[PDB]
Design a protein around this ligand. Structure first.
Ligand code: CA
Ligand code: CA
Ligand code: CA
Ligand code: CA
Ligand code: CA
Ligand code: CA
Length: 480
């Protein structure tokens, strides 16, 4: 049913310590088997316990707390607190707390008049052990002025939902999803935090980040990452819609993650790249609107690259792989580099650099002057002993504007296709033009590229860089 904190002695006056009163309301609601702890408008001061892991208030299974609205019900930390406090509202470590939530209320960490690391909302069970909180909701909650992490749901929580909420002016990250599972962050705003807007980390997976907005943060608008430990990477991370703008680092940064997707977002005004992808296995970058990034310097609106952790905790080298980059509007350069397996890589209006690496890739540059790089003869080839597969195709090569960068491959020029020359050929129905090495290597492979369309007469020697000197003369981008 309903429990009003005032009926348990809570004053809501901005000066009395209401911790024990609100906690009494919570314990009564839990002992009845579940209930709504109700708080009328006011500022309720709260204080911590003997240890950081006590937090301030302990929410419990089947208890929901409903305020009078963001800005109207404010739970605020007392002046003078000088001890690390991990969760102004939190569940208990070492207990599987479930079917609880907070709505229509503000948590104020009062960093101006306190010292020590404070987190707003903390969930989860026990780091490095199996077990989870589950069915956790925060609706229309505002978390502000904590010295560290605003929303800090933590390892492990399953079916966390945070919606229609706001984190601002927190000392580090507005939102952390630490080992969250099968969870949802929707229509939230995270702004003017000391470091990240949203930070999904520590093995989190099956996460939907829909229509969130992040601006004015000291670092990334959104970062999805493994973290500093040698643990399972996050995976199945779907970012849909929303806006990541005017941040101190990249708009969206994804690193050491598997099967991530970023679609339909507006990404602008960031100091670093709009989107940066580092060592991501399965990346979809679809239908975004990306402009005016790299305000702090830098040559690229989009960066795909590897993540070399060989000298770090895992000892591993992580390629970006399995990438699909399509339908984006990109007012500046895209660096689209991938590796083994089939990549679909589309540039936009900028002067882009495209290289699908090993396997059979489909590349398009769009407008501007783009460089399609082929770094190894085994990255686009045909073996007649078996399939034409493994031959890359360029969709829209534009003679006079685009460039084919073969500068590392050791061919001398166009010719009959032997002796280190490449032959320019048209297939039978005139739908594809090939550059071909007619000399098989020892495995029977022929370096070969397809250009979609008929370019046997339009293409010329100045469209291909055959060595580093030519590449310096002809290169179309700042990115090499
Ligand atoms: Ca718990
Ligand atoms: Ca302080
Ligand atoms: Ca590839
Ligand atoms: Ca382009
Ligand atoms: Ca182009
Ligand atoms: Ca390739």
């Amino acid at each position: 049913m309903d429990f009003d904190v005032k009926d348990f002695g809570a004053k809501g006056d901005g000066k009395s310590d209401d911790t024990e009163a609100i906690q009494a309301a919570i314990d009564a609601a839990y002992e009845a088997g579940g209930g709504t702890v109700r708080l009328s408008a006011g500022e309720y001061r709260v204080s911590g316990g003997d240890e950081a892991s006590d937090g301030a208030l302990m929410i419990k299974s089947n208890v929901y707390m409903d305020g009078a609205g963001m800005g109207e019900t404010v739970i605020k930390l007392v002046d003078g607190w000088d001890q690390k406090l991990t969760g102004i509202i939190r569940s208990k470590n070492g207990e599987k707390t479930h079917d609880y939530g907070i709505r229509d209320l503000t948590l104020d960490g009062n960093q101006d008049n306190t010292e020590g690391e404070v987190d707003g909302f903390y969930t989860g069970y026990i780091p490095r052990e199996d077990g989870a909180d589950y069915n956790v909701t925060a609706e229309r909650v505002e978390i502000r002025e904590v010295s560290r992490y605003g929303f800090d749901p933590h390892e492990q929580t399953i079916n966390l939902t945070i919606r229609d909420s706001v984190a601002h002016n927190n000392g580090k990250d507005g939102f952390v999803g630490d080992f969250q599972i099968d969870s949802t962050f929707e229509n939230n705003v995270s702004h003017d935090n000391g470091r990240h807007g949203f930070n999904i980390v520590t093995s989190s997976h099956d996460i939907l980040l829909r229509d969130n907005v992040a601006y004015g943060n000291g670092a990334n608008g959104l970062v999805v990452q493994r973290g500093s430990e040698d643990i399972a990477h996050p995976y199945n991370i779907q970012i849909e819609g929303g806006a990541y703008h005017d941040n101190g680092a990249e708009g969206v940064l994804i690193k050491m993650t598997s099967n991530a997707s970023l679609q339909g977002a507006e990404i602008y005004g960031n100091d670093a790249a709009g989107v940066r992808v580092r060592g991501v296995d399965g990346m979809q970058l679809l239908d975004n609107d990306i402009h005016d990034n790299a305000q702090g310097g830098g040559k690229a609106e989009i960066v795909l690259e590897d993540y070399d952790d060989r000298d770090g905790v895992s000892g591993n080298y992580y390629e970006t792989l399995n990438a699909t980059v399509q339908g984006n509007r990109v007012a500046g350069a895209a660096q689209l580099l991938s590796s083994e397996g089939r990549d679909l890589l589309d540039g936009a209006a900028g002067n882009d650099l495209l290289d699908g690496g090993a396997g059979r890739d489909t590349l398009s540059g769009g407008g501007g002057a783009d460089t399609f790089r082929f770094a190894d003869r085994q990255d686009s080839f045909r073996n007649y002993e078996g399939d034409t597969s493994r031959v890359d195709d360029i969709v829209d090569f534009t003679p006079g504007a685009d460039l084919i960068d073969l500068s590392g491959l050791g061919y001398s020029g166009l010719g009959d296709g032997y002796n280190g020359t490449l032959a320019l050929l048209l297939n039978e129905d005139g739908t594809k033009t090939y550059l071909k090495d007619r000399q098989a290597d020892a495995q029977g492979n022929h370096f070969e590229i397809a250009l979609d369309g008929n370019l046997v007469d339009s293409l010329s020697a100045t469209d291909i860089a055959f060595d580093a000197t030519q590449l310096e003369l002809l290169g179309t981008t700042d990115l090499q």
